[PDB]
Each structure stands twice: as C-alpha cells, then as structure tokens.
Short mmCIF file of C-alpha atoms and ligand atoms in Angstrom, two decimals:
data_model
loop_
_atom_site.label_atom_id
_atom_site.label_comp_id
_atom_site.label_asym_id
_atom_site.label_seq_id
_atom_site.Cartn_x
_atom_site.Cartn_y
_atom_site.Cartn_z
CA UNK A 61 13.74 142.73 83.44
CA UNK A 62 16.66 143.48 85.69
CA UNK A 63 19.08 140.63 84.73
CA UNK A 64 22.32 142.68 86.14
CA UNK A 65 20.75 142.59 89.27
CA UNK A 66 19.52 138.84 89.18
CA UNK A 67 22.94 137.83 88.04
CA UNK A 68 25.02 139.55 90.55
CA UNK A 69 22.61 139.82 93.54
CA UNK A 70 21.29 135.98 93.16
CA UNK A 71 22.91 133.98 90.52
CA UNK A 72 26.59 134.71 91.53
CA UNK A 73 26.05 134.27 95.24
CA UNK A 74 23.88 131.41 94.60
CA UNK A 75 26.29 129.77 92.98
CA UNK A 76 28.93 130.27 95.26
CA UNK A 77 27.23 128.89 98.21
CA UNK A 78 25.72 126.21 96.93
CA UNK A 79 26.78 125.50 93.13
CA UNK A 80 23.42 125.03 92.33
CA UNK A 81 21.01 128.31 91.21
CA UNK A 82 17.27 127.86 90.69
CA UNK A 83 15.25 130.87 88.21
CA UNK A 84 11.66 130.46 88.62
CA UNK A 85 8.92 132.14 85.78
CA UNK A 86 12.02 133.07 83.67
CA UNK A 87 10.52 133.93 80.01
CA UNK A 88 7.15 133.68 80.42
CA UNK A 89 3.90 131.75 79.57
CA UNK A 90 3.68 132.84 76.31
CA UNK A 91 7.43 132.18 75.66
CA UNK A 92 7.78 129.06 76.85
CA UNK A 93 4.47 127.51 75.44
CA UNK A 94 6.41 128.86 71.90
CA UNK A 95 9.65 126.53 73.18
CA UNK A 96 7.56 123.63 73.71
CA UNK A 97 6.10 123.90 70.16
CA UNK A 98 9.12 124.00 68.40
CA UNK A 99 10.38 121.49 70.53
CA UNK A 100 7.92 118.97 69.49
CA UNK A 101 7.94 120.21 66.27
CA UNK A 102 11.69 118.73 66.19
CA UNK A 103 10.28 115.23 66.26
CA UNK A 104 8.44 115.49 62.66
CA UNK A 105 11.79 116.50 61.28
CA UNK A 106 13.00 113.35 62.57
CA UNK A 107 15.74 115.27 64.58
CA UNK A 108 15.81 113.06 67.37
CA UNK A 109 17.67 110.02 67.72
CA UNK A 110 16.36 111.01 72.75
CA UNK A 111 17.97 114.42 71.96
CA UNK A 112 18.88 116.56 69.53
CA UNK A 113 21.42 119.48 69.37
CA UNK A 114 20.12 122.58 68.02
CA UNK A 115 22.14 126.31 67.05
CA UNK A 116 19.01 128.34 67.48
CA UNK A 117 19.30 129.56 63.93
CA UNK A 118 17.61 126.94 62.48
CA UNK A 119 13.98 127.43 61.23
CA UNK A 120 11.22 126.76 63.45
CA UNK A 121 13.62 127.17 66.32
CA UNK A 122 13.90 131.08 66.90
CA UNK A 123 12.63 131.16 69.96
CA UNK A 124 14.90 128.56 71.20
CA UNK A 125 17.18 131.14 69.61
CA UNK A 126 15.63 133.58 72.27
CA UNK A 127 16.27 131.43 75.43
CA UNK A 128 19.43 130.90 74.11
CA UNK A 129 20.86 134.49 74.21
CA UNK A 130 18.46 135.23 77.18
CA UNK A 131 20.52 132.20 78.86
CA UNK A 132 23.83 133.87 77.19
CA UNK A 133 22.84 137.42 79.07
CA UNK A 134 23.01 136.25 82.71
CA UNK A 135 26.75 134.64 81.98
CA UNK A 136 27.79 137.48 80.29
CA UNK A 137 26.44 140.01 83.55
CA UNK A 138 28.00 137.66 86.03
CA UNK A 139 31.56 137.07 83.88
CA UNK A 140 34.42 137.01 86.92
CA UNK A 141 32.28 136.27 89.29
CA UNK A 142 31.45 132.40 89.08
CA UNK A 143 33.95 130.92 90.95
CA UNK A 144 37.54 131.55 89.05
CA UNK A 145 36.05 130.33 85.70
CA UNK A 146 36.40 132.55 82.92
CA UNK A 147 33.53 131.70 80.53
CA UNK A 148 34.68 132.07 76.63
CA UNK A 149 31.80 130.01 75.13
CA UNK A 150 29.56 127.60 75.36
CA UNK A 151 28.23 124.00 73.69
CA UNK A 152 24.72 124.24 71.38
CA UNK A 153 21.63 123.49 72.73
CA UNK A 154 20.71 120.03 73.86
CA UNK A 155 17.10 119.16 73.55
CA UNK A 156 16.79 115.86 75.49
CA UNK A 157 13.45 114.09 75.26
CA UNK A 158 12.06 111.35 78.10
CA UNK A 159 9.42 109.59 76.23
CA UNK A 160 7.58 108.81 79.61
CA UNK A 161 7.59 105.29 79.88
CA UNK A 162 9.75 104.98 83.19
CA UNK A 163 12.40 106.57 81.29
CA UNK A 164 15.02 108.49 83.44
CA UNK A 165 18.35 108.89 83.43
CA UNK A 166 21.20 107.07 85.70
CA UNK A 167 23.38 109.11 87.89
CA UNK A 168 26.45 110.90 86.39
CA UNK A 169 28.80 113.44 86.39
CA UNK A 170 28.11 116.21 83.58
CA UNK A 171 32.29 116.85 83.26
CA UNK A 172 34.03 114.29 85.28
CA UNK A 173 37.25 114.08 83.12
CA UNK A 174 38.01 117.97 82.50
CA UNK A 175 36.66 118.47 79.08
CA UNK A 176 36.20 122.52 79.40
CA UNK A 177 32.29 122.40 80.67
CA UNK A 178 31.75 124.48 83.95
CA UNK A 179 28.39 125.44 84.26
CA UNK A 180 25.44 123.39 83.45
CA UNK A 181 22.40 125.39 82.25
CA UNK A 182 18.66 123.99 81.72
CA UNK A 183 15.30 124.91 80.82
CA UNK A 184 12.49 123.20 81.27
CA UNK A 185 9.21 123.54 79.30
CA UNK A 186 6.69 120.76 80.57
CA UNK A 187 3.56 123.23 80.53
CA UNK A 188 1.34 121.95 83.54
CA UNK A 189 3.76 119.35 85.01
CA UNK A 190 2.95 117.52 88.19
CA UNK A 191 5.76 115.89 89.63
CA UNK A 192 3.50 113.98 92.14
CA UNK A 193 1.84 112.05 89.09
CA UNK A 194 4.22 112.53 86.09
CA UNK A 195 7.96 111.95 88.37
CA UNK A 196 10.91 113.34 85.97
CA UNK A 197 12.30 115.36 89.27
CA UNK A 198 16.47 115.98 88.66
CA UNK A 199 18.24 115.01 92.13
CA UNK A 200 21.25 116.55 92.98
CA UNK A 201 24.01 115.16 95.50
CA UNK A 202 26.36 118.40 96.11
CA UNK A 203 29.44 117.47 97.22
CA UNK A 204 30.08 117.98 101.08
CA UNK A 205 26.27 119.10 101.44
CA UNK A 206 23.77 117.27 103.50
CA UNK A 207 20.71 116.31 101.77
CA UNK A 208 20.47 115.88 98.14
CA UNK A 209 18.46 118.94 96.34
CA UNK A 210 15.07 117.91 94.27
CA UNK A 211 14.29 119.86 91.58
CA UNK A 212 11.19 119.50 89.83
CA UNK A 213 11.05 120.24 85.87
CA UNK A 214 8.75 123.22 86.44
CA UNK A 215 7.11 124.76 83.36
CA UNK A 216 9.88 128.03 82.75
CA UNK A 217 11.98 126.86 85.28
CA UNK A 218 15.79 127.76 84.82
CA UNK A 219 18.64 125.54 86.45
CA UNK A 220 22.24 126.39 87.06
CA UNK A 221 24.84 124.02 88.48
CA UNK A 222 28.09 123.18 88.28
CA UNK A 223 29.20 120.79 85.45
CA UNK A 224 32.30 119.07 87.39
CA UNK A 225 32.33 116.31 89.78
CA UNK A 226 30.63 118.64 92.99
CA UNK A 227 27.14 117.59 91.40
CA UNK A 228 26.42 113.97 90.51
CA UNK A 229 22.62 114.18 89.24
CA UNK A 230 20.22 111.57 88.37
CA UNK A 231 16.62 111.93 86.78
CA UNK A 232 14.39 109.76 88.25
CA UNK A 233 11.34 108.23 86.22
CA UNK A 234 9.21 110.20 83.97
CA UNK A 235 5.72 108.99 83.59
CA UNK A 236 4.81 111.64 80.88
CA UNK A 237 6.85 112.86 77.94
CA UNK A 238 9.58 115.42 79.66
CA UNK A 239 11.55 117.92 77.83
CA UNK A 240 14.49 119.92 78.94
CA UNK A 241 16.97 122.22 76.60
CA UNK A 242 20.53 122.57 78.39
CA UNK A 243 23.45 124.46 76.90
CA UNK A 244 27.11 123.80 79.17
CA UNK A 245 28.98 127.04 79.33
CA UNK A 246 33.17 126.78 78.72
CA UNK A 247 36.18 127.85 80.94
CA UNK A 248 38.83 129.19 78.98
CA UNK A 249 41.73 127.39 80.36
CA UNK A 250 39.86 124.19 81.00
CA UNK A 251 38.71 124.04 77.19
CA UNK A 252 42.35 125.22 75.88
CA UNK A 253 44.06 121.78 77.22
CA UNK A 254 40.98 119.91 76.83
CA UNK A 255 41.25 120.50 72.98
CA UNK A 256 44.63 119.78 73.22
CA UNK A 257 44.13 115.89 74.32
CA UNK A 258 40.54 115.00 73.76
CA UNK A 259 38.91 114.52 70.44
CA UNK A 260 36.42 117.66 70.95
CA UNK A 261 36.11 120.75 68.98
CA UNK A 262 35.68 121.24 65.49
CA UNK A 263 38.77 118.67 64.63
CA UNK A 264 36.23 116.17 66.43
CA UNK A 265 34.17 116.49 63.75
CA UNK A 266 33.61 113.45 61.25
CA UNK A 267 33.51 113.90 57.81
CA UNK A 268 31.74 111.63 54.80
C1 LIG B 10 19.75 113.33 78.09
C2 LIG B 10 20.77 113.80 79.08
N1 LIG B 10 22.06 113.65 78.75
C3 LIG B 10 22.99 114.05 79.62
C4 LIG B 10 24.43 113.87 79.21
C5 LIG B 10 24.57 113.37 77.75
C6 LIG B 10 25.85 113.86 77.12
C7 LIG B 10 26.98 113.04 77.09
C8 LIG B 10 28.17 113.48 76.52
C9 LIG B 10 28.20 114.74 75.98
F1 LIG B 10 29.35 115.18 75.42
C10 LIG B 10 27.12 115.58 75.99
C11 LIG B 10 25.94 115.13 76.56
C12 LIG B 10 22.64 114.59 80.81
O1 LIG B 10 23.65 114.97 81.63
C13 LIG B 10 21.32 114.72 81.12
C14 LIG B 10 20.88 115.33 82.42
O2 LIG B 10 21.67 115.50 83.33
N2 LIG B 10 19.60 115.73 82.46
C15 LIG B 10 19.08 116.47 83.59
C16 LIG B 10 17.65 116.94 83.42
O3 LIG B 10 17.16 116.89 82.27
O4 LIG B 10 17.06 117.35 84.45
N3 LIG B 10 20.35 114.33 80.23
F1 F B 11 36.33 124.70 69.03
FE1 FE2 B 12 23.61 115.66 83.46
#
C-alpha cells in the first residue's frame, strides 16, 4: 500500500513528462465490484439526468466515499510537486453514465477558460470490459506530443491528466453501458480569480 512512493516515484514524474498518469489494479476486485453497485444503484434513485454528482457521504455511496479519499491521498503525498499548482480542493464526484448505444462523447477541453480545475482524475469500474467489442476507449491528443494516447476504461483503472488546454480528449463509442467517476482537483490561485469573475462556487448556487 505504498502510496508515498507511487505518488512521488510515478505519479509526479509521470505527470511531468507526459501530463497524463495511468494506475492500473488500484482498489481492488472486491472494491471496485462495491463502486459499480452503488453506481447502478444511483439510477433507481433517479439521480441521473447521463451523470450525477455525488459527496460520498450520501447513503449507499460509502465506498465511493472510499475512492474518494483514496483518490484525495495520492494529491495530498504529491502536494508541490505537480507542476507549480498548489492543490487546495477539489470538485465532487462526477458519475457519468454512457448508456451504450453509440454514445460517446465529442472532443473537448476539461478547463479551457481558467476556471481553477488542474488535474483531471477518473475511475473506471466496467467489471470485464472489452474494448475490442464494447469501444468506450478515452483518446488523448497531448499537446506537442506525437501520437494521441488510448486509454481503455479498464475495470480499477485510475487516470490522471491535466485539466487545461495540453489534453483535448474525446470518448469514442460505447457499445455497452460505461461508467466512469471523475473528481477535478483545484489550484489555489487559479480558483481565487476564477471565483472572482465566473459564476462558480457556492454564490453559483440557485436557490427556489
Ligand atoms: C460526461 C463527461 N462530461 C465531461 C465534462 C462535463 C462537464 C462540463 C462542465 C462542468 F463544469 C463539469 C463537467 C467530460 O469531460 C467527460 C470526459 O472527459 N469523460 C472521459 C471519460 O469518461 O473517459 N465526460
Ligand atoms: F467555493
Ligand atoms: Fe473531459
């Protein structure tokens, strides 16, 4: 369970070559078939409108909880070290859903406009997923880099990248129902101005 040295021996270097990290096997079988229950269990609740943003208080999501600080862990043992961001927080969970009718998801930029997001964090939890049949694979387009990076959505696979405009991402097709949770982890001094134009934070809240 050595996440100090994952963090600072792979993570951090990972990310500074590359700005992309890949964590294979990262909670476990057992774990992650728990994440997928809850995470369909979201849908009878009628959470979804797909995604859903989720705390990890919230009953019948606890072990989202889990991933959640286990996700929370690795920032905190790498804190200085990503780039020259200074991470202070970070958004709630975003459980996305791809129903799996040729559903996938046009290419973007995570942060283009500066609104505090700096690293991009997901987890996916498709149990037995076969990207040859079932598609769903995440291409990324670094910035500067030759090739674009595929990245399948591997059952307890972890993904780090940045969230600014060095990783325009697309999902292509998904021809089975694909999951993925993704929290986006906050630079100080990025968020402090970006809450000082843009309608985020807790003021960007609506009220009844
Ligand atoms: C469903 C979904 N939505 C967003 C952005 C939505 C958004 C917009 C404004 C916001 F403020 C907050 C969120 C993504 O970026 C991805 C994605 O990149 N998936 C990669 C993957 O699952 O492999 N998926
Ligand atoms: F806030
Ligand atoms: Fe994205």
């Amino acid at each position: 369970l050595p996440a100090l040295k994952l963090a600072l021996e792979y993570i951090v270097p990972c990310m500074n070559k590359h700005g992309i990290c890949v964590v294979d096997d990262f909670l476990g079988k057992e774990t992650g078939q728990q994440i997928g229950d809850e995470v369909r269990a979201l849908h009878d609740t009628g959470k979804f409108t797909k995604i859903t943003w989720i705390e990890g208080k919230e009953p019948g999501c606890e072990t989202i909880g889990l991933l959640m600080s286990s996700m929370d862990d690795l920032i905190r043992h790498c804190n200085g070290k990503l780039g020259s961001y200074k991470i202070n927080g970070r958004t709630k969970a975003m459980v996305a859903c791809y129903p799996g009718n040729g559903t996938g998801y046009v290419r973007h930029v995570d942060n283009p406009n500066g609104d505090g997001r700096c690293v991009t964090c997901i987890y996916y939890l498709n149990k037995d997923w076969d990207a040859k049949v079932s598609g769903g694979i995440l291409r990324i387009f670094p910035e500067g880099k030759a090739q674009f990076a595929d990245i399948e959505p591997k059952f307890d696979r972890l993904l780090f990248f940045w969230s600014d405009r060095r990783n325009p991402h697309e999902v292509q097709p998904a021809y089975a129902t694909r999951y993925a949770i993704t929290v986006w982890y906050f630079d100080a001094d990025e968020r402090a101005r970006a809450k000082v134009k843009y309608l985020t934070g807790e003021k960007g809240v609506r009220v009844e």
